Symmetry: none
Subunit: 134 residues, 2 copies
């Protein structure tokens, strides 16, 4: 499982809701059933996938969300980010401005995590069955 | 994950193809997406589900396959036995005669393995990203 991110839209202008601040992909090598991406950032308002990130100096905020085609917020206690089903090798996601905003000039630094959902096995005790054919 | 097996009888020494030698069940209490059953026995003809087992005395062989409704041979290099999707607590499987055979009365032993298929997240290394906003 591996992430890539490429930067988008960093001009000194208003950010529009949905503006891509970064575009990413997650790649999986093993048989898998789906994907999970999140930010290692403060979640806002009890949301799984809506975050506030901070400038390099710690003094300024930008509200963002993770999403894109096929991505759904992860439900339930402890949920983070978004999930998407699929067995294909790679899918794309975006980090987007969440609501129209004016933010302070600076370098904004954030952390993205991800995973591939891989079937694993929990084994039973092997059973040696003696069959009486008679 | 837990296995149980019970021998199944018939009307003589000829075991026709598909005749049951045993029926088992695999029980999975933890949240799971499916089931996997196999034998820890010699495989026949490079096929995941086909096995040959030994009598106690008399140097007799018995050829069997694992299967039953809802089970499919596991595909891929090193595939063992059969798999079946489902989230329910338990499913049944059969051990069946594989090909018509004339089998001497005796004890025939075979080791059955099983597992519950439980999704786990395989983590990517996290990525730091720097967004410069002017
Ligand atoms: Cl929205």
């Amino acid at each position: 499982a591996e992430l890539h991110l490429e930067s988008r839209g960093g001009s000194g202008t208003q950010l529009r809701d949905g503006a891509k601040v970064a575009t990413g992909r997650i790649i999986c090598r093993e048989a898998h059933t789906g994907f999970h991406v999140w930010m290692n950032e403060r979640q806002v308002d009890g949301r799984a996938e809506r975050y506030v990130v901070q400038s390099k100096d710690g003094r300024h905020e930008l509200r963002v969300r993770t999403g894109g085609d096929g991505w759904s917020p992860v439900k339930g206690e402890g949920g983070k980010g978004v999930s998407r089903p699929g067995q294909e090798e790679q899918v794309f996601f975006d980090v987007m401005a969440d609501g129209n905003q004016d933010i302070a000039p600076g370098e904004y630094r954030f952390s993205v995590g991800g995973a591939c959902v891989v079937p694993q096995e929990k084994l039973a005790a092997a059973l040696e069955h003696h069959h009486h054919h008679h």
